[PDB]
Write a protein that binds this ligand. Structure first.
Ligand SMILES: *[C@@H]1O[C@H](CO)[C@@H](O[C@@H]2O[C@H](CO)[C@@H](O[C@@H]3O[C@H](CO)[C@@H](O)[C@H](O[C@H]4O[C@H](CO)[C@@H](O)[C@H](O)[C@@H]4O)[C@@H]3O)[C@H](O)[C@H]2NC(C)=O)[C@H](O)[C@H]1NC(C)=O
Ligand SMILES: *[C@@H]1O[C@H](CO)[C@@H](O[C@@H]2O[C@H](CO)[C@@H](O[C@@H]3O[C@H](CO)[C@@H](O)[C@H](O[C@H]4O[C@H](CO)[C@@H](O)[C@H](O)[C@@H]4O)[C@@H]3O)[C@H](O)[C@H]2NC(C)=O)[C@H](O)[C@H]1NC(C)=O
Ligand SMILES: *[C@@H]1O[C@H](CO)[C@@H](O[C@@H]2O[C@H](CO)[C@@H](O)[C@H](O)[C@H]2NC(C)=O)[C@H](O)[C@H]1NC(C)=O
Ligand SMILES: *[C@@H]1O[C@H](CO)[C@@H](O[C@@H]2O[C@H](CO)[C@@H](O)[C@H](O)[C@H]2NC(C)=O)[C@H](O)[C@H]1NC(C)=O
Ligand SMILES: *[C@@H]1O[C@H](CO)[C@@H](O)[C@H](O)[C@H]1NC(C)=O
Lengths: 272, 190, 42
């Protein structure tokens, strides 16, 4: 199936080619279309006199998504003005990655051959981050994160506050908030102008960065005799308005006042 | 009425009698209304939704430095791993502050000392600055600023630790202070 | 008619917002010169 296939590097199978006479009677086995013609074979009945054939072919319905296996389809033939006048047997199996396979059978008679539309070679799956499986839904490749990444309660929500000296920031896992029930999040400080954004260090993260001064985005410094802590409240809602489960992550971190300091150069004098 | 306004147009007749015979008076008046109004209620509304509070915390450490300086006026940093000096040669140093919120704090110096080693807790210690102030029993020491801003500096003559001690380091200890909450400048006298 | 009424569940703007204010702008039309009935479908 996905490993036992024969490639077809033919650019004349495309729907744009003018006209031809080649009919596939010797084609047998799993096939993987490769080249400028396209990676998937036609979904609609392409008009007459195309695909280097007097009567071109197409597959009816939709392409299988990822994790579907062997699927039974009946590749129709367009000719004389009636779409799907002749039929051939085709079995599509989705594969892990950006290609598809077929048992391309001999049509009932010559003057019949398959086609290859430009398909979705533009649609790439590398855009999915490393933990996002290259899953598909009805032929489109999406970045579904780990199903093991499934947390129900928000008390288990992940957050990494790194209390940098010059600036404060809290980073949140995008996959965990996705599975928590959030499609698009709206993270906000005590001032909403401190809106959230996305960053990737080891995974998909959404983060905010705030200067560690008293006032600029409403963070509060309460310096007790020892520490100087900065607390700002984090606001989460997966849309403009919250109607239930109002979220308030009260983040803070303190900076000391005392610290040890020394050079990085040795020192030796010389004397009589 | 056109697409924007709606005018109510009428003509008025005026006379001193029932019958008119000269100078008929026509007060042709019309006032219009625009079609689009702006309205807003006069009551503030305060709903209530339950709020789940996940109070989380952390700890931070500021960035603060200490550079040897080749020149007086404390202008350029030493970058060599070791510096050779004469005992009579004056030493010229200063400490940098890049932690954050430089407007509020003042780099203030509780204590610095000299030890032959990099062990900060070396029992043999010569407090180069003693309790926020230079020693008076040593007069070659002089300061320009401490706690005045985010950067303090000072100069002194070189020494060597008596004994089999050929090396000298500087372990200094800095304390941040609010520039408005309290007065930070220590002014000592014998 | 000369009255426009409507309902909606109460909500709240995410962020540091403890108030919601409402501000409508109305358009008057002729009942005879044009069709003022608005009809929208998905
Ligand atoms: C001045 O204000 C500061 C800033 O808050 C304050 O420091 C705070 O001290 C309390 C009391 O120790 C800390 O409370 C925490 O509470 C829970 C458990 O009660 C834990 O998170 C902390 O304990 C951890 O301690 C170690 C930290 O790594 C670890 O062994 C382990 O994680 C423990 O769980 C801690 O007790 C609070 O976190 C600090 N705030 C900080 C560190 O930013 C200080 O007490 C105030 N000084 C005064 C009023 O004199
Ligand atoms: C739809 O119909 C409306 C109703 O007539 C119409 O608005 C009117 O526009 C005309 C043309 O501008 C205005 O006519 C006036 O004419 C003289 C100068 O030509 C002036 O009296 C007016 O200007 C005054 O504007 C202010 C009014 O106080 C003052 O700054 C000062 O008095 C100026 O002199 C004005 O131009 C007429 O007043 C308005 N009526 C309104 C606005 O209610 C509108 O233009 C029409 N729309 C179309 C035809 O697309
Ligand atoms: C098409 O896939 C089928 C199903 O695995 C392969 O075997 C065919 O199976 C159907 C249903 O049992 C039979 O009617 C066909 O005769 C089988 N075909 C052959 C060639 O034996 C089949 O191998 C696939 N087609 C090709 C050309 O590889
Ligand atoms: C720094 O110097 C001390 C003193 O020579 C080293 O030894 C420690 O000394 C203290 C008392 O000052 C003892 O209580 C400790 O048990 C000693 N050991 C340690 C590991 O602290 C100390 O090891 C030196 N530290 C460094 C980092 O050089
Ligand atoms: C193939 O699918 C098309 C479009 O979905 C439909 O019109 C046609 O009837 C199908 N053919 C068969 C043989 O079921």
């Amino acid at each position: 199936p996905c490993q036992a296939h024969r490639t077809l590097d033919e650019y004349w199978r495309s729907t744009e080619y003018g006209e031809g006479y080649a009919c596939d009677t010797d084609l047998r086995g799993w096939y993987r279309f490769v080249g400028q013609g396209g990676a998937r074979m036609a979904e609609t009945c392409v008009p007459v006199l195309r695909c280097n054939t007097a009567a071109p072919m197409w597959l009816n319905g939709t392409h299988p998504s990822s994790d579907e296996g062997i699927v039974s389809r009946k590749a129709c033939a367009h000719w004389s003005g009636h779409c799907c006048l002749w039929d051939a047997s085709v079995q599509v199996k989705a594969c892990a990655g950006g290609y598809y396979v077929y048992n391309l059978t001999a049509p009932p008679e010559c003057h019949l051959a398959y086609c290859t539309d430009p398909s979705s070679v533009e649609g790439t799956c590398e855009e999915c981050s490393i933990d996002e499986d290259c899953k598909s839904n009805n032929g489109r490749w999406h970045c579904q994160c780990k199903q093991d990444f499934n947390i129900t309660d928000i008390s288990l929500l992940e957050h990494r506050l790194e209390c940098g000296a010059n600036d404060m920031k809290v980073s949140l896992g995008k996959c965990q908030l996705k599975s928590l029930g959030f499609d698009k999040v709206f993270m906000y400080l005590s001032d909403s102008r401190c809106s959230g954004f996305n960053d990737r260090d080891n995974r998909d993260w959404v983060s905010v960065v705030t200067p560690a001064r008293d006032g600029p985005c409403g963070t509060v410094l309460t310096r007790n005799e020892t520490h100087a802590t900065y607390s700002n409240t984090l606001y989460l809602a997966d849309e403009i308005i919250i109607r239930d489960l109002n979220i308030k992550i009260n983040f803070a971190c303190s900076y000391p006042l005392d610290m040890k300091v020394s050079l990085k150069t040795a020192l030796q004098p010389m004397v009589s | 009425r056109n697409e924007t306004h709606a005018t109510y147009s009428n003509t008025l007749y005026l006379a001193d009698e029932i019958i008119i015979r000269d100078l008929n008076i026509k007060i042709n008046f019309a006032c219009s209304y625009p079609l689009d109004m702006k309205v807003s209620l006069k009551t503030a509304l305060q709903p209530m939704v339950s709020a789940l509070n996940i109070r989380v915390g952390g700890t931070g450490m500021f960035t603060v430095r200490m550079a040897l300086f080749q020149t007086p006026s404390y202008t350029q940093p030493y970058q060599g791993s070791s510096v050779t000096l004469s005992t009579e040669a004056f030493l010229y140093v200063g400490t940098m502050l890049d932690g954050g919120d430089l407007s509020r704090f003042a780099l203030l110096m509780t204590n610095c000392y000299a030890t032959p080693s990099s062990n900060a807790t070396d029992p043999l210690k010569y407090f180069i600055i003693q309790d926020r102030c230079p020693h008076t029993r040593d007069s070659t020491i002089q300061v320009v600023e401490n706690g005045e801003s985010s950067q303090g500096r000072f100069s002194v003559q070189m020494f060597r630790f008596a004994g089999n001690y050929d090396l000298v380091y500087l372990h200094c200890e800095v304390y941040l202070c609010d520039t408005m909450n309290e007065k930070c400048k220590p002014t000592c006298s014998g």
